[PDB]
Structure formats: structure tokens, C-alpha cells
Scaffold this active site. Structure first.
Site, PDB file in Angstrom:
ATOM      1  CB  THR A  80      -0.862   0.025   1.253  1.00  0.00           C
ATOM      2  OG1 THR A  80      -0.024   0.117   2.415  1.00  0.00           O
ATOM      3  CG2 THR A  80      -1.588  -1.307   1.429  1.00  0.00           C
ATOM      4  CB  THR A  94       0.696  -1.137   7.225  1.00  0.00           C
ATOM      5  OG1 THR A  94       1.627  -1.966   7.929  1.00  0.00           O
ATOM      6  CG2 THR A  94       0.443   0.010   8.194  1.00  0.00           C
ATOM      7  CG  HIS A 104       9.024   2.495  15.300  1.00  0.00           C
ATOM      8  ND1 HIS A 104       8.917   1.282  14.656  1.00  0.00           N
ATOM      9  CD2 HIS A 104       8.638   2.278  16.582  1.00  0.00           C
ATOM     10  CE1 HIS A 104       8.492   0.372  15.513  1.00  0.00           C
ATOM     11  NE2 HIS A 104       8.315   0.949  16.687  1.00  0.00           N
ATOM     12  CG  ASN A 111      18.158  12.324  13.186  1.00  0.00           C
ATOM     13  OD1 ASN A 111      19.144  11.708  13.591  1.00  0.00           O
ATOM     14  ND2 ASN A 111      17.465  11.949  12.115  1.00  0.00           N
ATOM     15  CE1 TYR A 148       6.591  13.236  32.487  1.00  0.00           C
ATOM     16  CE2 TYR A 148       8.455  11.816  32.053  1.00  0.00           C
ATOM     17  CZ  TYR A 148       7.881  12.837  32.753  1.00  0.00           C
ATOM     18  OH  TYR A 148       8.609  13.435  33.738  1.00  0.00           O
ATOM     19  CB  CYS A 182      10.289  21.407  35.006  1.00  0.00           C
ATOM     20  SG  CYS A 182      10.743  21.699  36.714  1.00  0.00           S
ATOM     21  NE  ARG A 232       6.800  26.562  40.648  1.00  0.00           N
ATOM     22  CZ  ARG A 232       8.040  26.159  40.912  1.00  0.00           C
ATOM     23  NH1 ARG A 232       9.070  26.943  40.615  1.00  0.00           N
ATOM     24  NH2 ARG A 232       8.263  24.970  41.455  1.00  0.00           N
TER      25      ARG A 232
HETATM   26  N1  LIG Z   1      18.855   8.232  12.866  1.00  0.00           N
HETATM   27  C1  LIG Z   1      18.458   6.974  13.205  1.00  0.00           C
HETATM   28  N2  LIG Z   1      17.837   6.210  12.285  1.00  0.00           N
HETATM   29  C2  LIG Z   1      17.430   4.976  12.575  1.00  0.00           C
HETATM   30  C3  LIG Z   1      17.669   4.440  13.920  1.00  0.00           C
HETATM   31  N3  LIG Z   1      17.167   3.197  13.952  1.00  0.00           N
HETATM   32  C4  LIG Z   1      16.634   2.905  12.731  1.00  0.00           C
HETATM   33  N4  LIG Z   1      16.845   3.963  11.951  1.00  0.00           N
HETATM   34  C5  LIG Z   1      16.141   4.122  10.808  1.00  0.00           C
HETATM   35  O1  LIG Z   1      14.702   4.157  10.799  1.00  0.00           O
HETATM   36  C6  LIG Z   1      14.339   3.675   9.478  1.00  0.00           C
HETATM   37  C7  LIG Z   1      13.523   2.420   9.594  1.00  0.00           C
HETATM   38  O2  LIG Z   1      14.376   1.343   9.964  1.00  0.00           O
HETATM   39  P1  LIG Z   1      13.759   0.012  10.644  1.00  0.00           P
HETATM   40  O3  LIG Z   1      12.429   0.349  11.297  1.00  0.00           O
HETATM   41  O4  LIG Z   1      14.849  -0.653  11.452  1.00  0.00           O
HETATM   42  O5  LIG Z   1      13.497  -0.942   9.373  1.00  0.00           O
HETATM   43  P2  LIG Z   1      12.038  -1.077   8.728  1.00  0.00           P
HETATM   44  O6  LIG Z   1      11.535   0.315   8.448  1.00  0.00           O
HETATM   45  O7  LIG Z   1      12.124  -1.903   7.474  1.00  0.00           O
HETATM   46  O8  LIG Z   1      10.992  -1.792   9.726  1.00  0.00           O
HETATM   47  C8  LIG Z   1      10.000  -0.834  10.185  1.00  0.00           C
HETATM   48  O9  LIG Z   1       8.874  -0.901   9.293  1.00  0.00           O
HETATM   49  C9  LIG Z   1       8.077  -2.106   9.506  1.00  0.00           C
HETATM   50  C10 LIG Z   1       6.893  -1.950   8.868  1.00  0.00           C
HETATM   51  O10 LIG Z   1       6.136  -1.056   9.245  1.00  0.00           O
HETATM   52  O11 LIG Z   1       6.550  -2.667   7.923  1.00  0.00           O
HETATM   53  C11 LIG Z   1       7.824  -2.287  10.817  1.00  0.00           C
HETATM   54  O12 LIG Z   1       7.134  -3.292  11.009  1.00  0.00           O
HETATM   55  C12 LIG Z   1       8.967  -2.276  11.534  1.00  0.00           C
HETATM   56  O13 LIG Z   1       8.764  -2.545  12.718  1.00  0.00           O
HETATM   57  C13 LIG Z   1       9.581  -1.074  11.430  1.00  0.00           C
HETATM   58  O14 LIG Z   1       8.853  -0.143  11.780  1.00  0.00           O
HETATM   59  C14 LIG Z   1      15.475   3.379   8.853  1.00  0.00           C
HETATM   60  O15 LIG Z   1      15.657   4.305   7.726  1.00  0.00           O
HETATM   61  C15 LIG Z   1      16.491   3.397   9.750  1.00  0.00           C
HETATM   62  O16 LIG Z   1      17.547   3.829   9.295  1.00  0.00           O
HETATM   63  C16 LIG Z   1      18.338   5.336  14.875  1.00  0.00           C
HETATM   64  O17 LIG Z   1      18.574   4.968  16.041  1.00  0.00           O
HETATM   65  N5  LIG Z   1      18.702   6.549  14.452  1.00  0.00           N
HETATM   66  N1  LIG Z   2      -0.902  13.826  28.822  1.00  0.00           N
HETATM   67  C1  LIG Z   2      -0.067  13.304  29.758  1.00  0.00           C
HETATM   68  N2  LIG Z   2       0.520  14.130  30.612  1.00  0.00           N
HETATM   69  C2  LIG Z   2       1.364  13.684  31.529  1.00  0.00           C
HETATM   70  C3  LIG Z   2       1.631  12.258  31.612  1.00  0.00           C
HETATM   71  N3  LIG Z   2       2.478  12.077  32.621  1.00  0.00           N
HETATM   72  C4  LIG Z   2       2.776  13.285  33.189  1.00  0.00           C
HETATM   73  N4  LIG Z   2       2.082  14.191  32.525  1.00  0.00           N
HETATM   74  C5  LIG Z   2       2.292  15.514  32.722  1.00  0.00           C
HETATM   75  O1  LIG Z   2       3.531  16.116  32.306  1.00  0.00           O
HETATM   76  C6  LIG Z   2       3.698  17.271  33.174  1.00  0.00           C
HETATM   77  C7  LIG Z   2       4.966  17.106  33.986  1.00  0.00           C
HETATM   78  O2  LIG Z   2       4.770  16.250  35.110  1.00  0.00           O
HETATM   79  P1  LIG Z   2       5.969  15.450  35.828  1.00  0.00           P
HETATM   80  O3  LIG Z   2       7.176  15.448  34.940  1.00  0.00           O
HETATM   81  O4  LIG Z   2       5.397  14.191  36.426  1.00  0.00           O
HETATM   82  O5  LIG Z   2       6.304  16.321  37.121  1.00  0.00           O
HETATM   83  P2  LIG Z   2       7.461  17.427  37.171  1.00  0.00           P
HETATM   84  O6  LIG Z   2       7.261  18.404  36.051  1.00  0.00           O
HETATM   85  O7  LIG Z   2       7.346  18.048  38.549  1.00  0.00           O
HETATM   86  O8  LIG Z   2       8.931  16.786  37.077  1.00  0.00           O
HETATM   87  C8  LIG Z   2       9.558  17.034  35.799  1.00  0.00           C
HETATM   88  O9  LIG Z   2      10.466  18.148  35.956  1.00  0.00           O
HETATM   89  C9  LIG Z   2      11.534  17.787  36.870  1.00  0.00           C
HETATM   90  C10 LIG Z   2      12.449  18.762  36.887  1.00  0.00           C
HETATM   91  O10 LIG Z   2      13.012  19.032  35.846  1.00  0.00           O
HETATM   92  O11 LIG Z   2      12.733  19.377  37.913  1.00  0.00           O
HETATM   93  C11 LIG Z   2      12.106  16.663  36.447  1.00  0.00           C
HETATM   94  O12 LIG Z   2      13.040  16.373  37.192  1.00  0.00           O
HETATM   95  C12 LIG Z   2      11.199  15.676  36.396  1.00  0.00           C
HETATM   96  O13 LIG Z   2      11.753  14.584  36.205  1.00  0.00           O
HETATM   97  C13 LIG Z   2      10.242  15.937  35.472  1.00  0.00           C
HETATM   98  O14 LIG Z   2      10.648  16.010  34.308  1.00  0.00           O
HETATM   99  C14 LIG Z   2       2.626  17.296  33.972  1.00  0.00           C
HETATM  100  O15 LIG Z   2       1.750  18.427  33.631  1.00  0.00           O
HETATM  101  C15 LIG Z   2       1.995  16.091  33.894  1.00  0.00           C
HETATM  102  O16 LIG Z   2       0.780  16.159  34.091  1.00  0.00           O
HETATM  103  C16 LIG Z   2       0.962  11.394  30.649  1.00  0.00           C
HETATM  104  O17 LIG Z   2       1.144  10.152  30.653  1.00  0.00           O
HETATM  105  N5  LIG Z   2       0.148  11.987  29.781  1.00  0.00           N
END
Ligand SMILES: Nc1nc2c(ncn2[C@@H]2O[C@H](COP(=O)(O)OP(=O)(O)O[C@H]3O[C@H](C(=O)O)[C@@H](O)[C@H](O)[C@@H]3O)[C@@H](O)[C@H]2O)c(=O)[nH]1
Ligand SMILES: Nc1nc2c(ncn2[C@@H]2O[C@H](COP(=O)(O)OP(=O)(O)O[C@H]3O[C@H](C(=O)O)[C@@H](O)[C@H](O)[C@@H]3O)[C@@H](O)[C@H]2O)c(=O)[nH]1
EC number: 1.1.1.132
Lengths: 436, 436
Positions: free
Chosen positions: A86, A124, A217, A225, A257, A268, A331
Site C-alpha cells: 500500500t 498496513t 518509530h 536527530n 508520560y 519545568c 506554576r
Molecule cells: N537516525 C536513526 N535512524 C534509525 C535508527 N534506527 C533505525 N533507523 C532508521 O529508521 C528507518 C527504519 O528502519 P527500521 O524500522 O529498522 O526498518 P524497517 O523500516 O524496514 O521496519 C519498520 O517498518 C516495519 C513496517 O512497518 O513494515 C515495521 O514493522 C517495523 O517494525 C519497522 O517499523 C530506517 O531508515 C532506519 O535507518 C536510529 O537509532 N537513528
Molecule cells: N498527557 C499526559 N501528561 C502527563 C503524563 N504524565 C505526566 N504528565 C504531565 O507532564 C507534566 C509534567 O509532570 P511530571 O514530569 O510528572 O512532574 P514534574 O514536572 O514536577 O517533574 C519534571 O520536571 C523535573 C524537573 O526538571 O525538575 C524533572 O526532574 C522531572 O523529572 C520531570 O521532568 C505534567 O503536567 C503532567 O501532568 C501522561 O502520561 N500523559
């Protein structure tokens, strides 16, 4: 079992072999007679570590074969795995062309054969595809009905190319989307032996799942990057930076998160996001993803406002005011932003927050609460039942455990808007979630 | 240890308590007299689970006190932790007002002080702050030189409000930014009993480390919200979708996809980024993050270009052509795009890739290679040495281990452009990395 596989590209051929080497009768189906000739010769159409070997093993045991004859492939098998491509149209929407032909080809092949066939999509496709396209197509072509006469389900793959086989052997998980129970069980046997969870969802949820994994991904690659670019610019190595970050399995790489919900706030997240992108901007380092965060964050506030505001009434009870439950910190609280919007636009607002309460007589924030934001703070009501009774729209703004009880003891006559996720289920005409 | 803590806010008060509960002597310092007073009565200025109890214990053992006499605090302690807030300026940049203030005072204090005092910054600051602001202001005010006379170091925090104490007692990891080993050892002796890895790095790296973590959290919430929104618009629960995504620790919640480097490509990621956003658009669902991935992605390709075409030489060798090592899949390969751009600009381009070379002999995608992209494939060269020798600029485009030799022992007169991460260290005049 006997399996036909439609489309013999990277995922189709890998499948052909992986199944054929586990004890299945496998028939590789493709439109191109080059790929199939290569297959019968037991040869891989692609460079994929260990694929040839598997394919040659498929011919030696006579367990694997290929043919360009769609109908036959169906009549000679009990399960069909759809793996055709696709690709993108010129506007981004996916081209269903190939999927459709296969569907027709299959339907026509069923009109004949009397036994039940099973059609499992692995390609997909956008959510809603199986229901709105493949099903009606097969039906309209087989003269039969999906579910009763023939089984339909979806089965996303997560194979990566160059490790397709090992990914196959040890998947993260196996996910199944099911219409009929019967088709679900078949898939269950097929992966029964894999050391990974099986996850059975509706066809649509499964379709969303595979899309999310793929965009997540790209999201990750993008983050690394953009971060790496800022790193180089300020003198350090990105690789070293991302490594340390990937060490954190409590926050950076956990589920934390990742709950779909309301905007982020606090003293923060928003400032650091502003602080790093400003810096990136000084170093002439562009950064579209990092630079779209705040924009998205505000959208989320707006979204809650549009939901809360759509019920022909000014009467809003806002449960939760601090940026998160358990702290009195106000805050940059998205809930205050939200509160301030409602006030600025003339809503009859009433707010509940026991932590902000305790703080109005027990902290070092008294000043701020009574002089910095009195127009918000004076709307605080400590009697939770009072807030509910005299409001029309109830808004769950933060994770206070007290708001669960509320979620299961909600009276008639009140609209719920859930921004964190207390609701046991999806939206209804009376209770609505921001992402469910 | 006798420890002074400047800034008795959420982070500093928690530190005061935890540190003091662990047997140290802690002098809490803050500009606000009302803050110091609640601390001397063992009371908590903020609403934070279990902090009060820690603060009273701190008082009751006489191991924790408070004052506004900065000079005294430095004079009666061996090490200080800087925890003053860093607020946003109207333009997004950081306001080092408070940091600077606290730096001046300390410097003035350690001057009159004979023995080595150790300064640690816990406040979140941009990369380079400490080298170009903290150290200089303290050196100046103290007459002493940073490093030899007084210890300096950075030591971020990952505490989250509302679980601050739990987060302190059980952190993801301890990150130390060290200048002089002495301070680095000091910090390690303190965090020795914490059940987590201790990470020691240069100041600049730790500064960038903390920031990356915060913007990464903000990106997770962002991704999750934007996915849930689309989820909801398509009829399913974004939560059910995000739970499953989080059940994958091999690809989703792991270190894969997190190496800074080159744009992503292949026949899935880009195609899927475009399809979902396309749908998202059809449904009136704004998605600034998801919707910026491709521009950012495409901005990486151009980034690699600028690196390559900056060496005043048209002779370029592109090692790696297919989207990744281990395959010959050319679909939407960023390397091909790179090549086509170089070609359109008239560079003497030579390309090595053992996989495609093999593919154009065995396989099914030979037509494409031969009749669809002849202008790229005829620049192919079978021998890796032939390409290396005849080129002035070599590009490491994919992770084919064959390229390891080239980077460990490189023929003189060649410029290295590392798009994947082969280089053992940072950029030099001969070998430049894209994110290092
Ligand atoms: N910069 C950077 N590029 C990365 C990294 N890891 C992978 N890449 C790139 O991300 C792209 C995708 O690579 P990868 O996901 O390993 O291979 P592929 O894309 O064939 O498999 C994915 O597509 C499948 C699918 O949807 O059919 C998925 O099923 C599969 O899990 C992957 O998402 C590639 O261009 C990679 O170069 C990284 O850590 N950093
Ligand atoms: N939508 C969504 N919101 C989320 C989720 N989890 C947390 N939040 C929110 O993300 C915001 C940050 O909350 P959190 O990071 O739990 O608390 P805090 O901001 O106090 O701690 C962060 O700042 C600290 C710091 O830099 O001093 C960090 O140290 C700390 O680890 C956090 O990144 C909040 O508004 C949250 O509600 C989630 O799964 N979904």
C-alpha cells in the site's frame, strides 16, 4: 495448516518461509512471475539474512510453493494472509489498489469452494480499512457474508528488514484484530509457540496500533536527530547524550508520560522546552519537531475548552487546579490556563482542589494565591458535592484519586469531560474524554 | 558531611530533608524569610507527600537548620548545592538572575574561607552555563581559581513533584557533571547508597543530559496526546492504543531508533507518517508534532548535503545506498536522495554498496535498479578500495561493518562524513560527524 500468502515482498516472502519452516503447507502468491519462479527455485527475491536458506528448505520438504494463480491458491488453502503493498498516493493517502484486486480475486474464489476460508490482513492499512473496504469487497464478490461464511481478522507485523527472520522468531508482541472469534483462535495457534504476548483487539484498534508503532518509530528517530544536532552545535557528542538518556528505564523509556491526555504544565517542562529551542535558534540549528511541542501543547488546552464549552451552559465545575494531583504547584498549570480562559469568556466557574486549599493556609504560596491570581483562587470551593450539584459540566482535570469515586457516582443531569482518563470506557452523549 | 543548600523551593527543600535524613548536616538557605521560618519550625512550605515529616526530623536531631546569612552557610559547610530557580524571560531564554546572585555571594564567602569549599549546581541550566557564567563569577568574586582552589560540578535532578521523595530515594540514575575529580568523588560518596547507576561526565554533557530528558518527556506526552486525538477521531480509545504500544520493549520502549544520525527512510516509516497525518487532516485533527516529522526528516538529508559539499571538491564517495545495512531495499532511501542531489549539482559521485550490487544480479528488484534509477546505479562500483582511493570525500551512509576499517585506519587526503556513528569520537578536520 495450509496457508496462502498474497504478495511476496519483504514481509510476504519472510512469512512464506517462516511459516513453511514451522510445519505449514505454504503457497506463495504474487502477480509477478519472476518472484514466483525464484521461489519455486527456492530462491529469495531479496537480500535478507537467512531467507534463501529458509526458502530452499521449503522446496526440499515440498512444504512451500508459489503460483500466480490466485483462485487456485485459495481453493488449495484454508488461510490467506494478505501482505501486498500500500504505497503513497500523490497526496499522502494510501493507495488501496492492490489490496482491492486481491480482495476481489479472493471473493471470486470463495463463491466456488464450499468450506470456510479465513482471510487475514497483514498489510498496513489506515484504521477502518478492513470494515469499509476489504470486507464489503470480498462479500460483494463472493456473494457471501463476512463472519458467518468466511473469517476475517487483521494481523499487523512488526518485522524489520535485514532482521525480518529474527524479528519474526522473537517479536515484541503478537497483535490480532478480530471480527469473528473463530479467526482469532486460528491466529492464536499460529503464534502460540512464540515467546511474546498475544493481544486480541477489534479490527480498528489493531489498525491504529500498527500505525502508532510506526509513527512513534519515526518520532524517536526524529528526536534523536534534532537533539544530536543541538548537541554538535554546542560542542558535545549527541551519541553520548542519547546513551545516558536511554539508560533511564523509569521515565525516558517506560510507559510514564505516555497516557493520552491533557496538556503538560508545571515549572519545568514548558520552560525547558522553551529554553532549549531558543538556544537551538541562536545556534542556527533548525528543529521542526522540538519546535512544534508548545504549539501542540496549547492545542490541547484549546481542545478541552472546545469540549467543555459545547453544551449551551455557563456552568462549569473544574476538578483539579494544580498542574498535577498531590502538589500545590500552580506554576504554568494548564488547568489555570483553562480556568482563565473560561473566566475571560464569562463562564460561571467553580473550582475544587484540596491541595491548593491546604496551601491557602499552610504554605509559602499564600501571597501568590491571594494576590497573583485572586480571580481564579476565589472560585475555589472546598465542598466537592457542592461543586458537583451546582455545575452542569464536570471537568476532570488532574489525577486526584478522589475523582474516581466521582466518575462512578455521577448524577443524572451532568456532562462529564474527562481530561486524564478516569472513565472506564469511551465517550457517550453524557460523558466525553479528550482522547476516548 | 556539612551541606549547604541554596534555594529552598520544591527541589531544594526535598534535598534538604532527604540529605539530612541520611545523617548529614544541612543548612537551608533562601532569600525569603518566611521560607526559612517554616523550615525552622520543621514545617513544609509546599504540599509534597512526606516532606514535612522529613523536615521536622531534620530539626529534631539538630541536623537541619535555616538562614539567610549566605556567608555563614558557606563558612559552616564544606559543600553547597545550588537549587535556585531559573525562570523564563519573555523570549524563552533562561534568566540567570538568581543563579548569578547566588554565585556572587558564594565567591565572596569562599574568599574569606581558607579550606576548599565545593560547589554543585543542581539547577537546570543550558549547556555551557557553568563554564561561562558560574565558574567566572565565582573565580572573580573569590580570587581563587575554579578547580584547584574550590571544587565545582554539575549534578542534575530528575525528581518529579508529588513523588519528589520517592524519586530521590529511588532515582532512574544519578548524573554527575565533573570538572575536578575531587568533586566528582565527593558526589559519588553521597549517592553511593542509591540503587541506581551513577553516570559521570563533563559538565557540558550533563547539562545537555538533563535538558534532553525534560524535552523528551514533553515529547512523549505530546506524541501520546496527538495520537489519542487521532485515535478518538477515528472511533477508538487512544488509551487502549497507547497501552499496547507500551507493551513492546523491543522496539517501542527500548534504545532502538534513538541514535542521532541520518533521516529515516524505507517503504514504511515515511509512507506511514504521511498516511496518518493525511487521515488526521481529513478529520480536522491538528497535529503539529506528527505533522512536522517529514520537514525535520527532510531537513536532515539537506544537512548531510551541506556537510559533504563544503569541502571544495566534486569527488564524492557514498558508501551505502540501500535504506539500511543488510538489505538492498532502495525504496525512499535517504542515501539515494543524497546521491540524486549530489548528481543534480554535478559532483563526481562514486557509490559503494555490496547489497544492491548483488541485488542487481540476483533478485526481483533488478528492473528498478536497471531501468528506473539508472542514473544512480551506474555510479556503482564493485570494489570498495576503488571508491575510497578515487574520492576525496567519503560518506558513511549506512551501517555496513565493511566501513569500520576505513574509519579506524584512514588513507590520508580524505575527508570523512559520518552519517551513522562509526567515529569513536567527536568531529576533527579529517572526519566530521552529523551529530558529533
Ligand atoms: N537516525 C536513526 N535512524 C534509525 C535508527 N534506527 C533505525 N533507523 C532508521 O529508521 C528507518 C527504519 O528502519 P527500521 O524500522 O529498522 O526498518 P524497517 O523500516 O524496514 O521496519 C519498520 O517498518 C516495519 C513496517 O512497518 O513494515 C515495521 O514493522 C517495523 O517494525 C519497522 O517499523 C530506517 O531508515 C532506519 O535507518 C536510529 O537509532 N537513528
Ligand atoms: N498527557 C499526559 N501528561 C502527563 C503524563 N504524565 C505526566 N504528565 C504531565 O507532564 C507534566 C509534567 O509532570 P511530571 O514530569 O510528572 O512532574 P514534574 O514536572 O514536577 O517533574 C519534571 O520536571 C523535573 C524537573 O526538571 O525538575 C524533572 O526532574 C522531572 O523529572 C520531570 O521532568 C505534567 O503536567 C503532567 O501532568 C501522561 O502520561 N500523559
Amino acid at each position: 495448516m495450509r496457508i496462502s500468502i498474497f504478495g511476496l515482498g519483504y514481509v510476504g516472502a519472510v512469512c512464506a518461509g517462516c511459516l513453511s519452516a514451522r510445519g505449514h503447507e505454504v503457497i506463495g502468491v504474487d502477480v509477478s512471475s519472476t518472484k514466483i519462479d525464484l521461489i519455486n527455485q527456492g530462491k529469495s527475491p531479496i537480500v535478507e539474512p537467512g531467507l534463501e536458506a529458509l526458502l530452499q528448505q521449503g522446496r526440499q520438504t515440498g512444504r512451500l510453493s508459489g503460483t500466480t494463480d490466485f483462485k487456485k491458491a485459495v481453493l488449495d488453502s484454508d488461510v490467506s494472509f494478505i501482505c501486498v503493498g500500500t504505497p503513497s498516493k500523490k497526496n499522502g493517502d494510501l493507495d488501496l489498489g492492490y489490496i482491492e484486486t486481491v480482495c476481489r480475486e479472493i471473493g471470486f474464489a470463495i463463491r466456488e469452494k464450499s468450506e470456510r476460508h479465513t482471510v487475514v490482513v497483514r498489510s498496513t492499512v489506515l484504521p477502518g480499512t478492513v470494515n469499509n473496504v476489504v470486507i464489503p469487497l470480498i462479500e460483494d464478490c463472493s456473494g457471501k457474508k463476512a463472519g458467518v461464511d468466511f473469517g476475517v481478522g487483521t494481523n499487523p507485523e512488526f518485522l524489520r528488514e535485514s532482521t525480518a527472520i529474527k524479528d519474526y522468531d522473537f517479536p515484541p508482541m503478537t497483535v490480532i484484530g478480530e471480527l469473528d472469534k473463530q479467526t482469532g483462535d486460528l491466529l492464536e495457534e499460529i503464534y502460540r509457540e512464540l515467546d511474546a504476548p498475544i493481544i486480541r483487539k477489534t479490527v480498528e484498534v489493531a489498525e491504529m496500533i500498527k500505525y502508532t508503532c510506526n509513527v512513534w518509530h519515526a518520532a524517536k528517530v526524529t528526536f534523536a536527530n534534532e537533539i544530536g544536532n543541538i548537541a554538535k552545535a554546542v560542542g558535545v557528542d549527541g551519541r553520548e547524550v542519547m546513551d545516558v538518556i536511554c539508560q533511564d528505564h523509569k521515565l525516558n523509556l517506560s510507559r510514564y508520560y505516555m497516557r493520552p491526555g491533557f496538556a503538560f504544565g508545571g515549572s519545568c517542562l514548558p520552560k525547558d522546552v522553551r529554553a532549549l529551542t531558543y538556544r537551538a535558534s541562536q545556534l542556527d540549528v533548525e528543529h521542526p519537531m522540538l519546535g512544534s511541542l508548545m504549539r501542540s501543547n496549547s492545542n490541547q488546552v484549546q481542545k478541552a475548552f472546545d469540549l467543555i464549552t459545547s453544551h449551551d451552559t455557563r456552568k462549569v465545575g473544574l476538578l483539579g487546579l494544580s498542574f498535577k494531583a498531590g502538589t500545590d504547584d500552580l506554576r504554568e498549570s494548564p488547568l489555570v490556563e483553562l480556568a482563565e480562559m473560561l473566566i475571560g469568556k464569562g463562564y460561571e466557574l467553580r473550582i475544587f482542589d484540596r491541595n491548593v486549599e491546604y496551601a491557602r493556609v499552610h504554605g509559602a504560596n499564600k501571597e501568590y494565591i491571594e494576590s497573583k491570581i485572586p480571580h481564579v483562587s476565589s472560585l475555589l470551593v472546598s465542598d466537592l458535592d457542592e461543586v458537583v450539584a451546582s455545575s452542569d459540566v464536570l471537568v476532570l482535570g488532574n489525577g486526584d484519586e478522589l475523582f474516581v469515586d466521582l466518575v462512578n457516582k455521577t448524577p443524572s443531569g451532568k456532562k462529564l469531560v474527562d481530561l486524564v482518563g478516569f472513565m472506564p470506557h469511551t465517550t457517550t452523549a453524557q460523558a466525553e474524554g479528550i482522547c476516548w
